Amino acid sequence: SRQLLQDEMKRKEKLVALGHLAAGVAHEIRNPLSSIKGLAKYFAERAPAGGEAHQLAQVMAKEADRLNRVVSELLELVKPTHLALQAVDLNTLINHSLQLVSQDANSREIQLRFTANDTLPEIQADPDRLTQVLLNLYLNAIQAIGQHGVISVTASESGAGVKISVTDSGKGIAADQLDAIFTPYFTTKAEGTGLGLAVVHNIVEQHGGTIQVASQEGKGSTFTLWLPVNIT
Amino acid sequence: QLLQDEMKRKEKLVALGHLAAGVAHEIRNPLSSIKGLAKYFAERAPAGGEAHQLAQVMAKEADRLNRVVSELLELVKPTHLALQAVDLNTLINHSLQLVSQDANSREIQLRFTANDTLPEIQADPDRLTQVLLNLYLNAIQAIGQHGVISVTASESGAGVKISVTDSGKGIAADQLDAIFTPYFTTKAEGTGLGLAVVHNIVEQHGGTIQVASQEGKGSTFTLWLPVNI
Ligand SMILES: Nc1ncnc2c1ncn2[C@@H]1O[C@H](COP(=O)(O)OP(=O)(O)O)[C@@H](O)[C@H]1O
Ligand SMILES: Nc1ncnc2c1ncn2[C@@H]1O[C@H](COP(=O)(O)OP(=O)(O)O)[C@@H](O)[C@H]1O
Ligand SMILES: [Mg+2]
Ligand SMILES: [Mg+2]
């Protein structure tokens, strides 16, 4: 028995270690990309405007920024699961996230809607990762509405856990794309990282919850989150 | 359930491979164009100036990013096969036995007939067992209760064919290749990595996997593996 546990512990250790080394390699990819992004901006600025050199240098800079954001999200995904659990009231966390996105919503003329239920029970979760998830969903919704929209967030008690649903009024998603939407590296945006919903899924998986989506193209979309009241 | 954990770890390694190949593609298409732009700016700029040196620096940086992405890919590259002689009858039986209790409780019938004349192939038993377990679990999920699971093994050419047929719930034909793509799944819970592991192991061995499915009727998955790699 002593050796068998030593064994299972060793296989688990090998997977987490591979994750740690992968995070390091990703951090080292960020360094030449950041160098490339800076040097491509210099060349774009110094190059004669309007020409092919200027266009190519600016496109390459934009691509290097997109690549740094892709690599940061990849690091978030490859990193071993590390959750700082805490008892959190969801109303306060949701309000804080909404206040975090308020300026960008008002700039684009998008309404933030959320009603709080003080009856709502506290959940065992990592508040920073839940923020990173809510913000990713909010950003997706904002990009999709583009202007003149509304975001409705609600929280309710489902069995044991809670369901936070974020509904937008944007372009929606076709049923054909309704499955590749969570697939890594898939995006319909030229300045998009197709890893935001991958990160959302990973974080909600580490929390033992579920992410589901219901969308009608043009009408809008709704992302529903189930998070357990007790992590165990 | 320590088996379930080992399965999950294999799924995570396959996922890391996919993520790495994706970042590599996304990083590599621009790289060549950046290196050319660097070369044009450097030839245009006077020798020794700041634009010249910085252009060489940008080129070297693109080459270094290629080296680092190659490193990530090599790190997630799967270990070579532990090639050993395997009697597939014994393996299929052990695989079904690892599923015996869950199939029994969920009212699932396990049917296999062994051919004594079936040759023993050079393969990795643990990985083949992983492909079999993945196919079986997917099949049980396809039908919670009142189903039958049929496995057949046969010689074919210079190889062997194993077919897993289930009553299940069926998969439409409009989504056939996409079933093998990693992170692809038709259930709310669950990863989309099982058949990704299956395909990775089969292609590692040197064989092929094919699917047949009638909606509402059931699904058949066929594996061809070589006798000597
Ligand atoms: N609220 C939404 N409304 C419409 N489409 C959405 C929404 N959220 C996600 N999507 C779709 O999912 C794809 C993947 O999103 P994600 O993985 O977060 O990356 P990105 O936001 O960079 O595209 C988007 O390109 C888009 O097509
Ligand atoms: N034999 C089958 N019968 C019915 N549906 C299947 C079968 N095999 C795979 N599927 C569907 O395709 C998805 C892809 O399988 P897989 O990648 O293993 O995902 P999972 O880990 O959720 O089982 C499954 O989740 C299931 O929804
Ligand atoms: Mg996004
Ligand atoms: Mg599966």
CA A163 to ligand 3 centroid distance, Å: 20
Per DSSP (E only), the strands in chain B are: 84-86, 108-112, 121-123, 147-156, 159-166, 208-214, 218-226
Whether the Cβ atoms of residue A203 and residue A132 lie closer than 8 Å to each other: yes
Residue A190 lies in a domain: yes
Residue A44 lies in a domain: yes
Answer yes or no: do B132 and B109 share one domain.
yes
For residue B60, the chain A residue with the least C-alpha distance is A32
In the three-class reduction of DSSP (H, G, I as helix; E, B as strand; rest coil), residue B149 is classed as strand
Answer yes or no: do B131 and B222 share one domain.
yes
**CA distance to partner chain A, nearest, from residue B81 (Å):** 18
Sign, CA dihedral B200-B203-B207-B210, equals positive
Q: Supply the residue whose CA is at minimum distance from atom 14 of ligand 2.
A: B185
Q: Which pairs from B24-31 meet CB under 8 Å and 24+ separation?
A: B24/B69, B24/B72, B24/B73, B26/A67, B26/A70, B26/A185, B27/A29, B27/A33, B27/A67, B27/B65, B27/B69, B28/B66, B28/B69, B30/A60, B30/A63, B30/A64, B30/A67, B31/B62, B31/B65, B31/B66
| Residues spanned by the domain of A101 | 86-227
Answer yes or no: do A31 and A114 share one domain.
no
- Residue B181 DSSP class: S
- Specify the number of domains making up chain B: 2
Answer yes or no: do B219 and B166 share one domain.
yes
Answer yes or no: do B51 and B92 share one domain.
no
Contacts for A55 with CB less than 8 Å, ≥ 6 apart: none
Resolution (A): 2.5
Q: Point out the domain boundary residue: B21, B41, B76.
A: B76
Whether the Cβ atoms of residue A50 and residue B90 lie closer than 8 Å to each other: no
Answer yes or no: do A124 and A199 share one domain.
yes
- Residue B192 DSSP class: S
Q: Point out the domain boundary residue: B76, B111, B129.
A: B76
CA A143 to ligand 4 centroid distance, Å: 33
Answer yes or no: do B42 and B123 share one domain.
no
Q: Point out the domain boundary residue: B76, B95, B114.
A: B76
Residue A154 Cβ contacting ligand 1 at under 6 Å: no
Helix (H) or strand (E) holding B58: helix B50-76
Q: Which tokens in the block code for residue B192?
A: 């989309």
C-alpha distances out from residue A114 to A93, A117, A151, A193, A204, Å: 12, 10, 9, 28, 21
Residues of B in contact with A21 (CB under 8 A): 75
Residue A216 Cβ contacting ligand 1 at under 6 Å: no
Answer yes or no: do A204 and A93 share one domain.
yes
Domain CATH code at residue B198: 3.30.565.10
Q: CA B222, B76, B223 angle in degrees (round to 5)?
A: 5
Answer yes or no: do A91 and A143 share one domain.
yes
Phi, psi of A211 (to 5 degrees): -115, 125
Answer yes or no: do A70 and A102 share one domain.
no
Answer yes or no: do A138 and A164 share one domain.
yes
Residue A232 lies in a domain: no
Answer yes or no: do B102 and B145 share one domain.
yes
Sign, CA dihedral A135-A137-A143-A147, equals negative
Rounded-to-integer distance, Cα B1 and Cα A210, Å: 22
Residues with CB under 6 Å of ligand 2 are B 134, 138-139, 142, 166, 168-169, 171, 179, 184-187, 190-195, 219
